[PDB]
From Swiss-Prot:
Keyword Lipoprotein: no
Effect of residue 150 to I: In Azurite; shifts the excitation and emission spectra to shorter wavelengths and increases quantum yields compared to BFP
Name of protein: Green fluorescent protein
Consequence the record notes for mutating residue 33 to R: In mut1.28; shifts fluorescence lifetime from 3.03 to 2.76 ns. In mut2.2; shifts fluorescence lifetime from 3.03 to 1.94 ns. In mut3.3; shifts fluorescence lifetime from 3.03 to 1.88 ns
Length: 230
């Protein structure tokens, strides 16, 4: 299929990644840069994020989802369902609203596309209605991350997809902070794209710290595998 060929071909080996985020949550401004690489053959991402403006004013785990679905490993039997690669290299827009239960919400817009050999994810994040003393602005979330299925459906009238999912962030007192994710992606190009049957992405995320890093930062290891159409 010369369509599967084209997107396939962009992702076959290790691809460098650049992430840039401009953030304002309740007027607390911040910028993050990340760098790393993805190897979609294995569903594998390795990234390191740095807050370049100082202290990150929100917990690092709340930004994990925001900070590359094109790097998912789609099984051979599911390649006709891979919207994300099919949009490349022109890319796609990924927009979210994420509702933190009993607290504020993030609204994000990103463009994910190639700049030469580099896969780039440029993001604007606005958060509003946060509790200054809540779990987010009050930094009460543990520095860890749970595994989660993410449900993809076609958004035929917008030539794209919608994605819905819940993330439970562990709180330091032992409880959980729900983060309810609503997501839409649409191609940037005017070309054809693969529009998928309902299926899901299985995520595993491991957060760590660079022992030689003095800046406020997050190292993120993600494995992502498509499933749900046997």
């Amino acid at each position: 299929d010369p369509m599967v060929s084209k997107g396939e071909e962009l992702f076959t080996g290790v691809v460098p990644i650049l992430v840039e985020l401009d953030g304002d949550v309740n007027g607390h401004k911040f910028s993050v840069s990340g760098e790393g690489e993805g190897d979609a053959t294995y569903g594998k991402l390795t990234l390191k994020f740095i807050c370049t403006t100082g202290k990150l004013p929100v917990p690092w785990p709340t930004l994990v989802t925001t900070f590359l679905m094109c790097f998912a490993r789609y099984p051979d039997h599911m390649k006709q369902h891979d919207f994300f690669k099919s949009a490349m290299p022109e890319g796609y827009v990924q927009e979210r609203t994420i509702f933190f239960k009993d607290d504020g919400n993030y609204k994000t817009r990103a463009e994910v596309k190639f700049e030469g050999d580099t896969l780039v994810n440029r993001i604007e994040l606005k958060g509003i209605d946060f509790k200054e003393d809540g779990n987010i602005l009050g930094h009460k979330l543990e520095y860890n991350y749970n595994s989660h299925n993410v449900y993809i459906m076609a958004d035929k009238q917008k030539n794209g997809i919608k994605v819905n999912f819940k993330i439970r962030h562990n709180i330091e007192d032992g409880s959980v902070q729900l983060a309810d994710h609503y997501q839409q992606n649409t191609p940037i190009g005017d070309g054809p794209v693969l529009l998928p049957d309902n299926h899901y992405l299985s995520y595993q995320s491991a957060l760590s710290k660079d022992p030689n890093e003095k800046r406020d930062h997050m190292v993120l290891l993600e494995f992502v595998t498509a499933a749900g159409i046997t």
